User: Which sequence fits this backbone?
């Protein structure tokens, strides 16, 4: 499936993912495309910050869901 | 020390404090 | 019982419902009044998005509760 990743500016990123991919897998995909290191990425879906180890379906993130990306220093 | 979840003024949706606009309806956070 | 559905533009809509009505029943009722397809309706109550599985009583939604209609 494909999902979207939206930053605070509204810039949207398109990822191709399996519902089985972990949040770490997804952060690495964001890192390749965007150059943000995973430890500086906060992903947020349905008002909750996601866990590195957990997977996309653990959060019932499905095809075309939009995750929000927020920085950290 | 980031702040509590906040309820959107437009739809009540309970947001992560790191989002500046409502995740559901996109209304900017009310202060 | 009555409940209200408030849209993102201020419009408040009055519905006739039963506590045993499912979220999809509620969406179909909104379609019947406003002509919005259920597939485009998100219902928000008490900070939570309501899921097609449950009934109003599941969500402890009582007489004259206001739901919020988010179109997506
Ligand atoms: Zn909202």
Assistant:
């Amino acid at each position: 499936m494909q999902i979207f990743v939206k930053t605070l500016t509204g810039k949207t990123i398109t990822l191709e993912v399996e519902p089985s991919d972990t949040i770490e897998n997804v952060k690495a995909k964001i890192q390749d495309k965007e150059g943000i290191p995973p430890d500086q990425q906060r992903l947020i879906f349905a008002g909750k910050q996601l866990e590195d180890g957990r997977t996309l379906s653990d959060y019932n993130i499905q095809k075309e869901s939009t995750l929000h990306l927020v920085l950290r220093l | 020390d980031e702040g509590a979840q906040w309820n959107c003024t437009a739809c009540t949706f309970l947001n992560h404090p790191a989002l500046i606009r409502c995740e559901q309806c996109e209304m900017p956070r009310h202060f």
Notes: The CA atoms of residues 41 and 71 of chain C lie 5 Å apart. Chain C is about 15% helix and 35% strand. Residues 1-72 of chain C form a domain with the Ubiquitin-like (UB roll) fold (CATH 3.10.20.90). Chain C touches chain A at residues 49 (CB under 8 Å).
